[PDB]
Design a protein around this ligand. Structure first.
Ligand SMILES: C[C@@H](c1ccc(Cl)cc1)n1cnc(-c2ccccc2)c1-c1c(C(=O)Nc2cccnc2N2CCC(N3CCCOC3=O)CC2)[nH]c2cc(Cl)ccc12
Ligand SMILES: C[C@@H](c1ccc(Cl)cc1)n1cnc(-c2ccccc2)c1-c1c(C(=O)Nc2cccnc2N2CCC(N3CCCOC3=O)CC2)[nH]c2cc(Cl)ccc12
Lengths: 93, 93
């Protein structure tokens, strides 16, 4: 399917869903951009980014660290982030 | 996104949508498989397939012929069919 005519939906696993809904999300399926929107909000509101180095997220004491399995990560490393998110998506076949 | 965790939706243009709804479809977005399900039904119910050569669809006197722009096509030629369907999908970006 041509990328222009195509809408792609993902279904977060229970823990990611609870996180997304904790910042105002209502539904069960999302585009990746929508998941990123809410994850961005979560990070901002819990002030997980380092004020001095605003590209590193420190999440070791937060549920995000559980979901992602790392104590911290760089927002500049997109593919790593997508990988971490994919681990929290329901296989729908 | 891993293909297993991914649901892809398309939005039929007005004429295809009217065709899909003419055979029981209710919604505005569909997976490709869902569009194919309803197109298959349309073809069966209007008996557009050739009883003697059941792989050729004759649609020149039908709205399907307008949508697809051909007087007939083979069901064995999948990529041609997908191409014809893509012309009837709303670009959603
Ligand atoms: C391109 C984007 C990103 C997308 C995809 C990927 Cl893979 C990576 C980055 N981005 C860039 N900086 C952050 C990001 C970075 C740090 C903390 C939070 C979000 C993000 C981000 C968003 C997001 O929706 N961003 C966004 C989208 C559109 C416009 N503007 C955006 N940003 C708002 C906060 C803004 N910001 C950052 C801290 C300093 O002040 C400030 O205004 C910096 C600009 N969502 C995320 C989810 C996670 Cl897990 C991690 C990072 C993000
Ligand atoms: C794999 C499939 C197809 C998919 C994708 C693509 Cl690209 C091409 C073929 N298929 C194969 N034969 C026809 C197809 C062929 C001719 C007429 C109508 C549908 C179709 C079909 C379906 C569909 O959903 N098929 C289907 C799906 C699942 C199980 N069984 C299925 N079929 C029911 C009618 C069945 N059949 C055909 C006539 C003789 O009696 C009979 O029982 C032959 C078996 N939808 C369509 C839409 C269009 Cl525009 C054109 C053809 C089809």
């Amino acid at each position: 399917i041509p990328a222009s005519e195509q809408e792609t939906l993902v279904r977060p696993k229970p823990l990611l869903l609870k996180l997304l809904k904790s910042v105002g999300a209502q539904k069960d399926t999302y585009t990746m951009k929508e998941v990123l929107f809410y994850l961005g909000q979560y990070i901002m509101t819990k002030r997980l980014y380092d004020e001095k180095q605003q590209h590193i997220v420190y999440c070791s004491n937060d549920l995000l660290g559980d979901l992602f399995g790392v104590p911290s990560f760089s927002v500049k490393e997109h593919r790593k982030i997508y990988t971490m998110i994919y681990r929290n998506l329901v296989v729908v076949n």
